[PDB]
Antibody
């Protein structure tokens, strides 16, 4: 019943410093194991950064020396990662984990973007079907979120209610800005009678938009 | 600092078939310190095989590892839908610890034709002085597919943002979204927009289109 959980800034400017916090639960940082910090670059390449032993001593990847510092707080039961002088190359998903033998434990992971680009909320647009021309057995609505940054936006259809027959697509970075979309297919009878709303949340700019798809 | 080279990098496998992933090290390593991880989209890696050949907890009997010296390999008896994922190998027999590039495995299925939908811009984006035409191509396979945009029958390739989902875990299909962004300026200077899709499931292109006229 071990639980790991990364936590951090999300967005940080070049040459600045990064501070991540891994909170462990259901087990002590002192009892045993090696506590690792692992990062996955966009492209999926995996890199072992370093660890802190339960004894408190450390080991670092030779390419992160001088910039890295893994430490902990036995009273809080959590270790930390500090990377200073971050470049864009340090953009990735950061994980903390321990594990030996037929098992291990990882945190959900935390995305950290290293860019000078400014935070920008999203523009959410409804995507209804063309006027008179869609009446098969199933209709398809959509939602388009664009102009936001940094990455990480949460979209749900009818606040979780609609889950089947939906497809959210991976955001794309076009000129320092993100575009992302999602479609939802239902039977022709459902819409536009029953309300179908598109829920969109962008944390890095604390914005929550709700757009119901209305017939053209 | 040992470089772990993995292959194949990507591969499609039919259910029931046998597949063998490989991991080559630039220098010999202790068989005891060679792990294998499986990573499903949007989830963190999980230990799959430890010490070259020992199955981890929860791992199905069909998986199996082996290897020694400078060559290690993972093997699947008969492929399954759920075995579709990325597989990395790790070596911690020498500092620093290094992973391999990974091998993605896609599950081959029966061909299926895409269901295409097209959408004109919305009032709101127009008000902003911008126009985006969106086209969704849902539930298809193979993954290779071409998409062309035609504005007034003329082919436009600039300002096209494509994005794919991953092989669906429910039907092993893919889905794509194509977006064309233009200035409200250029959107009004033309009348017909067409999303033309060319897939294997047919000789003729699947097309959807609308006219600013009819609205």
């Amino acid at each position: 019943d071990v639980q790991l959980q990364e936590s951090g800034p999300g967005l940080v400017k070049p040459s600045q410093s990064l501070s991540l916090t891994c909170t462990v639960t259901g087990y002590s940082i002192t009892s045993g194991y090696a506590w690792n910090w692992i990062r996955q670059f966009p492209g999926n390449k995996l890199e072992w950064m370093g660890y802190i032993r339960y004894s408190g001593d450390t080991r670092y990847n030779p390419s992160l020396k001088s910039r890295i510092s893994i430490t902990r707080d036995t009273s809080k039961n959590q270790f930390f990662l500090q990377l200073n002088s971050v470049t864009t190359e340090d953009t990735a998903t950061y994980y903390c984990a321990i594990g030996y033998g037929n098992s291990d434990y990882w945190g959900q992971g935390t995305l950290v973007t290293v860019s000078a680009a400014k935070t920008t909320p999203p523009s959410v647009y409804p995507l209804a079907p063309g006027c008179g021309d869609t009446t098969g057995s199933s209709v398809t609505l959509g939602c388009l979120v664009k102009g936001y940054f940094p990455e990480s936006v949460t979209v749900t259809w009818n606040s979780g209610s609609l889950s089947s027959s939906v497809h959210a697509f991976p955001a794309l970075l076009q000129s320092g800005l993100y575009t992302m979309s999602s479609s939802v297919t239902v039977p022709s009878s459902t819409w536009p009678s029953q309300t179908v709303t598109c829920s969109v949340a962008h944390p890095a700019s604390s914005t929550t938009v709700d757009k119901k798809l209305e017939p053209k | 600092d040992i470089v772990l080279t993995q292959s194949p990098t990507i591969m499609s496998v039919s259910p029931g078939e046998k597949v063998t992933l490989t991991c080559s090290a630039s220098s010999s390593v202790s068989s005891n310190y060679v792990y294998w991880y499986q990573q499903k989209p949007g989830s963190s890696p999980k230990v799959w095989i430890y010490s070259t050949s020992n199955l981890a907890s929860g791992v199905p009997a069909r998986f199996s590892g082996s290897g020694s010296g400078t060559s290690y390999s993972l093997t699947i008896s008969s492929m399954e839908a759920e075995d579709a994922a990325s597989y990395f190998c790790l070596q911690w027999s020498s500092f620093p610890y290094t992973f391999g590039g990974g091998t993605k495995l896609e599950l081959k299925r029966a061909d299926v034709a895409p269901t295409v939908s097209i959408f004109p811009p919305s009032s709101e984006q127009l008000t902003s002085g911008g126009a985006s035409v969106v086209c969704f191509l849902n539930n298809f396979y193979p993954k290779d597919i071409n998409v062309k945009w035609k504005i007034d029958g003329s082919e436009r390739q600039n300002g096209v943002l494509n994005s794919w989902t991953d092989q669906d875990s429910k039907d092993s299909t893919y889905s794509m979204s194509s977006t064309l962004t233009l200035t409200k300026d250029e959107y009004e200077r033309h009348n017909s927009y067409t999303c033309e899709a060319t897939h294997k499931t047919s000789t003729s292109p699947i097309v959807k289109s609308f006219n600013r006229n009819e609205c």
